[PDB]
Design a protein that fits this description.
Chain A is mainly beta. Helices cover 8% and strands 48% of the residues of chain A. The termini of chain A are far apart. The structure holds a molecule of 8 linked components (NAG-NAG-BMA-MAN-NAG-MAN-NAG-FUC) (2 copies). It is classed as immune system.
């Protein structure tokens, strides 16, 4: 039971947000200490690449080694459907262990986004919750965030994706705001980024009417 | 050697008079060399003997798996009693034990708010009614719908999500027909949680105006 390889995809935030840089990460574990120097080979649609940043053999608590390599991807390359292979070689193993990862397959379904105001029985309280329903999207990789009067917010929570009755997912975002600022005529904005949208972004608005 | 895992009753079982809640003791990794296992059950440090120990399962790993189920009283589980499963073998240097009890913390009753379908959703034949349930501790809860008294089969609920103040929240979504929403049919979101009166509350919705 020697080396074990695990390949992880980039984070949806990174793939969807232009200014970021998404990464694909190869993790080798249980590298035992007789022969602990491991060599990485990276392939993109079967073409070798060499621009990954391989880390040095970190130690572990179970007196095993854990080596990591990070390959930079370009946004459109990941969302075009290319496939990323990590082939890992170590002196103590029969034939190099390999793993591939690529974008979740299935025909992309675009999310419908809706904004829900506070219920009637919540106005008695000091703070009110605005709701953002995001439903009908596939794949499940999604980013949702709020912003009020042009500039961001931090005070919000988003449920994990929930599989719906028809192979699509949905989620809810919640934003706690002060009833004073809600009923004094301020606009809030729910914004979602997902691969199937126009410019990978759309946003709905909410404001007392 | 073996491994013991003690699992608590399901929340539905505890919250519902009709159901019967159970604590489940699982033992894994029991070698075929000495494969006979036995259970002692203690409740608040008092030995019970009314458990239902099953025969010893076989497993693919070339190991065995034994299970023992103990019935509990609804009120007993909700009073904070502690449930100990003491497992002894022959290849065990000494008996292993696990204990389990209610999630400790100060119970906080949930707030239930019903939400109608958004402005821009009403162009479709199908319409989403949403239950917001917030500010409850612990996370163990059971949410279900009904319309005009009759149970619904077609709703999806979020996992519990931790909020900024240690309490949890969740959202439940029932999909019904535009026709039957516009038809002044009342729907009802009901929630069962230990911190409520009668471990139950219900808030309803319909085309109010
Ligand atoms: C020695 O120690 C090392 C490290 O120590 C570890 O960390 C410290 C904190 C300790 O306290 C301990 O917690 C722990 O020991 C151990 O290294 C760990 O080893 C395990 C297995 O040996 C790794 O595997 C994990 O497995 C699950 C699920 O993944 C697949 O593999 C399972 C096989 O065991 C299988 O049962 C699953 O079903 C699943 O199978 C996959 O299924 C899909 C289906 O869609 C299929 O397509 C795949 O082909 C199939 N793959 C198969 C079969 O191989 C999971 O728990 C692990 O991923 C995450 O695990 C943790 C949860 O987040 C987290 O620790 C990890 O970081 C990882 O999270 C991701 O990390 C990357 C970068 O690291 C990051 O970019 C991501 O954002 C992040 N994601 C999230 C959500 O956080 C993993 O798949 C563990 O990964 C591995 N952990 C580490 C840190 O190396 C070692 O086992 C010990 N050895 C011994 C002998 O004890
Ligand atoms: C032989 O095979 C058996 C079984 O085969 C298994 O299933 C088949 C399908 C295979 O294909 C494989 O998938 C798999 O091998 C193997 O036996 C299994 O072995 C593992 C570990 O050896 C057991 O692990 C699981 O453990 C989690 C929690 O893990 C605890 O320990 C971790 C470290 O070991 C630690 O990191 C965790 O945090 C956790 O530790 C606890 O943490 C809490 C934190 O609050 C703390 O309070 C505790 O004090 C602390 N305690 C300890 C000791 O660490 C456990 O939660 C899992 O239980 C449920 O979830 C599984 C799915 O993830 C599910 O399969 C289980 O059946 C179980 O399901 C529950 O069942 C009850 C009643 O039956 C029901 O009421 C629940 O609703 C239900 N819930 C769910 C979600 O299913 C899990 O147990 C496995 O239990 C164990 N046996 C199984 C899976 O039957 C064995 O390894 C194989 N042999 C070899 C050599 O490998």
């Amino acid at each position: 039971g020697g080396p074990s390889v695990f390949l992880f995809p980039p984070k949806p935030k990174d793939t969807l947000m232009i200014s970021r840089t998404p990464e694909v990460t190869c993790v080798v574990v249980d590298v035992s200490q007789e022969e602990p120097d491991v060599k990485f080979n990276w392939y993109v649609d079967g073409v070798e690449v060499h621009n990954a940043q391989t880390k040095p053999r970190e130690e572990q608590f179970n007196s095993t080694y854990r080596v990591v390599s990070v390959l930079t991807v370009t946004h459109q390359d990941w969302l075009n459907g290319k496939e990323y292979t990590c082939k890992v070689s170590n002196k103590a193993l029969p034939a190099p262990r390999q793993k591939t990862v690529s974008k979740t397959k299935g025909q992309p379904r675009e999310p419908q986004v809706y904004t829900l105001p506070p219920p009637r029985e919540e106005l008695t309280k000091n703070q009110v919750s605005l709701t953002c329903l995001v439903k009908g999207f596939y794949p499940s990789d999604i980013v949702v965030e709020w912003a009020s009067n042009g500039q961001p917010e931090n005070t919000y929570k988003t449920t994990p994706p929930v599989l719906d009755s028809d192979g699509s997912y949905f989620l809810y975002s919640k934003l706690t705001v002060d009833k004073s600022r809600w009923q004094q005529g301020n606009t809030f904005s729910c914004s979602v980024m997902h691969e199937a949208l126009h410019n990978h972004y759309t946003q709905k608005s909410l404001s007392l009417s």
